[PDB]
Paper text:
Pyrroline-5-carboxylate reductase 1 (PYCR1) catalyzes the biosynthetic half-reaction of the proline cycle by reducing Δ1-pyrroline-5-carboxylate (P5C) to proline through the oxidation of NAD(P)H. Many cancers alter their proline metabolism by up-regulating the proline cycle and proline biosynthesis, and knockdowns of PYCR1 lead to decreased cell proliferation. The biosynthetic half-reaction is the reduction of P5C to proline catalyzed by NAD(P)H-dependent P5C reductase isoform 1 (PYCR1). Electron density for each analog was present in the previously characterized proline-binding site, which is located in a dimer interface and consists of the αK–αL loop of one protomer and a kinked α-helix of the other protomer. In each case, the carboxylate of the analog binds in the αK–αL loop, while the ring contacts the kink between helices αH and αI of the opposite protomer of the dimer.
The electron density maps for THFA and NFLP were unambiguous and allowed for modeling of the inhibitor at full occupancy in all five chains of the asymmetric unit. The formyl group hydrogen bonds with the side chain and main chain of Ser-233, whereas the carboxylate forms a bidentate hydrogen bond interaction with Ala-237. A unique feature of the NFLP complex is that the protein changes conformation to accommodate the formyl group of the inhibitor. In the absence of conformational changes, the canonical proline binding pose places the formyl group 2 Å from the carbonyl O atom of Val-231 of αK. To avoid this steric clash, the side chain of Val-231 rotates from rotamer 1 to rotamer 2, and the αK helix translates by ∼1 Å. Because the αK helices of different protomers meet in an oligomer interface of the decamer, this conformational change involves two αK helices sliding past one another in opposite directions. This motion necessitates the rotation of the helix end-capping residue, His-223, to avoid steric clash with Asp-229 from another chain. The addition of the formyl group to proline increased the affinity by 17-fold, equating to ∼1.7 kcal/mol of binding free energy. X-ray crystallography revealed that NFLP occupies the P5C binding site, consistent with kinetic data showing the mechanism of inhibition is competitive with P5C.
Numbering used by the authors:
A (entry chain E), B (entry chain E): 1 to 273
C (entry chain C): -1 to 273
D (entry chain D): -2 to 273
The structure:
């Protein structure tokens, strides 16, 4: 099979790099297109083996699965540019935040009547094949289309099917989650440096701490609260540090963040509607 | 070689499980001892293949490397119990928080004059072989002793040598860090549930988000701030969520936490001095 | 070259551009004119001693200028356009500096007189006066391609300048348009802190200003983003990382984000209020 | 001073920044500069090599081939350096400590155990010397000749602002201009986040924020006004800027920067007293 990318943002690069690292796709069977392709990401993808072109039309003509990794504002402009080139073989996979299956199908249906559409919310760590992906199938997607999507995106991380009305919430949690983590890792590093550690060592240890904790959770049947309980010894350093987190309302800020991101995602649909 | 554990807390179990999963030690070459061994962790370690005993003395007699995974309060009581049994072959590895190499050597030197002592700060994710470990070598540790320690603890995570005066700070960062992460994952899950996701899915996606983000950081040369910049698209959901984190002082709470844990660790030394 | 520049309005922004353009030597002699209803005598004196021609009639500036800067308050823009509208000619480039006011609304006023007014909208800031301004501009629907290039070269002589899409200008206003006032507020507070710890006020003002200029210049001359530079200069256990913690505890970052957003939102309100 | 050699004990960020500024200003030949450091596997050590600076692992070699000696090491290393090279300090030497908090008195006391009249200067500079826009103060020790202080004023003025102060002000200077660039990097990172939130590309938001701050600082430096008057001058009635100033005030923005200068100054004083 052949995969194409319309758009060349951080996400298209991350997916193409994950797919090739996963060995599920010969990078020569990947094509990308952009309006502005920087001399870096161009040389990044050209050194990767990904054929490029500045015309979205050529990418559609040589690709089977079409990932749309463009800003939600640009999706309808793209769809009306390539809709005449959409064939029956194509599966159109929108990664745009908020943009609904219905709006994409209604644009494409003006050309050929049964577009096969999938909507997905994934994230940048597909680049190291630890992405978190959900997807919903559209009204003309054959059953095999969803199984293919599940197989392909599982090669670069966790992936599961959801009902479309959960995707804005998923965007607030795992779509934006890596930025929450980078912010937390920056701050944990500042705390390590304050108490005397070299910056390099502080960044490394904070990151390894988070990675091991998350893997511990993924590999147990327990919820986060029981694990917190398990590792907080009576009277110890850790329970003292947890108290100062609670005193600033640490937990509510992360709830606030998921909510704010989910709500903004819904606005990005409405503004594009 | 043969490894022994004095104490059977969450840490001794986590290390023994990591070592056996790593295949660096035949679990029959691991011995553990505890004052109170619960019928679970006993059956956990007995099903694992680890020989047990309720006498610390037998564990010393059949082990080469001796991990002391007991509360800092109990260390000097242990040392005066086993000090007469310490032989020239033994390497004594203290995992206790705050307890200094000097205090351990001064206890053991009352018996035989050149105890080989190592101090380390590791964490529970060694159980899934993603620990974060630092260690400092004592005044009679041969050079090979530190290289052995580095090899053994690298089989269950990241490991590096540090000067002893950084270890209290490391405790505040990666020693306590998993609890910070479990707290954050609990709260991120509450945020996902608030916006409509099933609890199971919310826990899974938050954890995968954190793991992928941390792996992304470990696999780039960049610091956390540049990665935050890379994934925050103009006007998007993520930058909106980051603002609400900043408005609650999210960053300062994690700095507060590392500081509080490091300071409490120093108190645990002084109270034991 | 042979080109002439005119200012309608004589507030602090128009003064700052006239002074910066003359310090740049980018125009021939006597090529700058400015007009206003009630110009204060100091501004009259300063501009006159600068070589800038002055007149109370906006029509005179229009008639002797090729590039026309409108540096008046957004509320005043519709009245000026009604006054000068019949005097706008094909050769003219109308550059609006008013916050919020859209190219669309300017072209709509001017088109009732002549059909194809050449309009550019820009957001610049006061430090053009020392040739370190930050300027963005957007071109209107009847601007020739050479009009944007002319504007770029002109405003580059007094600072950074780049073209943007018009829908970014409100956000630029919140960042570099209001930026200098955020900096003056910060420098006043840093000086207060220096004085609290025992420095003379004069020394505290100078040191804080020099620290901010040096820091901004470091960033401009590196490929790095600010986060990496913060990491580079915060030594373990040191005085600087201790002070960064107290900034974080008060949510220092969130306040500057709040400021950019508040200025951008108010700028959007200044368009609609005119519309 | 086309004949004098400059030496750096320490080859870190400050040493690189000064050496780069000194050579960029043409005030010193790079081959007249020598630096020593504990470990050579530093990015700063490699950059010094490429600049033409001579590097050595032995502090005593630096001492023996330099006339002006910059101590660019952490405060708690100063007493260890002074014990190592004290016997090699000759009469021609000017010793310039850049360490935060460490007093002239403590440096002279160590060196005087060897030769009796060490010429010592204490300074507090900052990283922007690397683009020749540093902010520097210095105080002269009890055996410094009058030409030593004016030589110091001459050398450091080539990489930014420089003035002599009484020593009891240097801890305060550290909290203001020593730590100052870090306050600005934090402020620039947040302003860029603000620009991005409102729809600007990140690269453009970084560029515009930096240019705004540079131009503001230069405006202030080039007037006789204090910052308050300039804030008044650029804040038009009912406008976007004054609305934004109000939200800064509502979070106590001014008090946070006062808190910062104070916290850095207090920590600098602790760094001395710990070493004492
Ligand atoms: O209880 C957990 N931990 C991990 C670091 C040391 C110990 C403590 O909290 O004191
Ligand atoms: O910019 C990053 N992301 C990830 C989720 C969607 C997009 C956004 O912020 O709008
Ligand atoms: O680390 C940076 N600096 C600049 C001033 C002194 C030193 C410190 O923070 O202690
Ligand atoms: O008053 C100052 N300024 C600078 C940006 C625009 C204008 C305003 O605040 O509305």
């Amino acid at each position: 099979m052949s995969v194409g990318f319309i758009g060349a943002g951080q996400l298209a690069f991350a997916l193409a790099k994950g797919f090739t690292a996963a060995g599920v796709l010969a990078a020569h069977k990947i094509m990308a297109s952009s309006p502005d392709m920087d001399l870096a990401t161009v040389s990044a993808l050209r050194k990767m083996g990904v054929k490029l072109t500045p015309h979205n039309k050529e990418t559609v003509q040589h690709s089977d699965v079409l990932f749309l990794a463009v800003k939600p504002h640009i999706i309808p402009f793209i769809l009306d540019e390539i809709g005449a080139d959409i064939e029956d073989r194509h599966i159109v996979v929108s990664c745009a935040a908020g943009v609904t299956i219905s709006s994409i199908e209604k644009k494409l249906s003006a050309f050929r009547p049964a577009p096969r559409v999938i909507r997905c919310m994934t994230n940048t760590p597909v680049v190291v094949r630890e992405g978190a992906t959900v997807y919903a199938t559209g009204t003309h997607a054959q059953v095999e289309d969803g199984r293919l999507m599940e197989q392909l995106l599982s090669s670069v991380g966790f992936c599961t099917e959801v009902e479309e009305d959960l995707i804005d919430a998923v965007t607030g949690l795992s779509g934006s989650g890596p930025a929450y983590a980078f912010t937390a890792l920056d701050a944990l590093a500042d705390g390590g440096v304050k108490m005397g550690l070299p910056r390099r060592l502080a960044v490394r240890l904070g990151a390894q701490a988070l990675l091991g904790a998350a893997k511990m959770l993924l590999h147990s049947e327990q919820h986060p609260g029981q694990l917190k309980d398990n590792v907080s010894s009576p009277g110890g350093a850790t329970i003292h540090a947890l108290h100062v987190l609670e005193s600033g309302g640490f937990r509510s800020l992360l709830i606030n963040a998921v909510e704010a991101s989910c709500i903004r995602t819904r606005e990005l649909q409405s503004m594009a509607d």
